[PDB]
Curated annotation (Swiss-Prot):
Cellular compartment(s): Secreted; Secreted, Extracellular space; Secreted, Extracellular space, Extracellular matrix; Extracellular vesicle
The gene coding this protein: Apoe
Residue segments, region LDL and other lipoprotein receptors binding: 129-139
Protein name per UniProt: Apolipoprotein E
One cellular component (GO) term of this entry: very-low-density lipoprotein particle
């Protein structure tokens, strides 16, 4: 990924793809297979989840700043509100990712309290809770995508023509 994709319709692609890597990793975790379980005690899962969450947030932030720079003419008041809303939606998304990572840390800690033994009971509660948070994350990510779409706005053929000329 040595270059940043710059096609006009692909401006949301970097954050959404970062989000997708997060979601794929999570669907793997959700199986709670014998290999997932070990790797969760080994702190690889939460470290990797954490790298994926962070990269999502970095691409959401780059994208919001890019939209805000390509916005307008627009009333200050409305840029302020459209920004307000993106920020709020972003935050919900981060909160949901934190809850995931943190639930997985709680599970690792409960297993440490049992000296590396897991039970069916606590695996089943983890399983159930992950699914519910995964679904909440989808909803909030869809909400963030909608907030960003609204923001992509502001003001085009005129500008292009003034580059092409003939200009007098």
């Amino acid at each position: 990924p040595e270059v940043t994709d710059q096609l006009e319709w692909q401006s949301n692609q970097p954050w959404e793809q970062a989000l997708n890597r997060f979601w794929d990793y999570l669907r793997w975790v959700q199986t709670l297979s014998d290999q997932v379980q070990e790797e969760l005690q080994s702190s690889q899962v939460t470290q990797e989840l954490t790298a994926l969450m962070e990269d999502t947030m970095t691409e959401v932030k780059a994208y919001k700043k890019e939209l805000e720079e390509q916005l307008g003419p627009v009333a200050e008041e409305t840029r302020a509100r459209l920004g307000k809303e993106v920020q709020a939606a972003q935050a919900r998304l981060g909160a949901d990712m934190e809850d995931l990572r943190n639930r997985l840390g709680q599970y690792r800690n409960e297993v440490h309290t049992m000296l590396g033994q897991s039970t069916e009971e606590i695996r089943a509660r983890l399983s159930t809770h992950l699914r519910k948070m995964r679904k909440r994350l989808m909803r909030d990510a869809e909400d963030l995508q909608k907030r960003l779409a609204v923001y992509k706005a502001g003001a085009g053929v005129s500008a292009i023509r003034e580059r092409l000329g003939p200009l007098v």
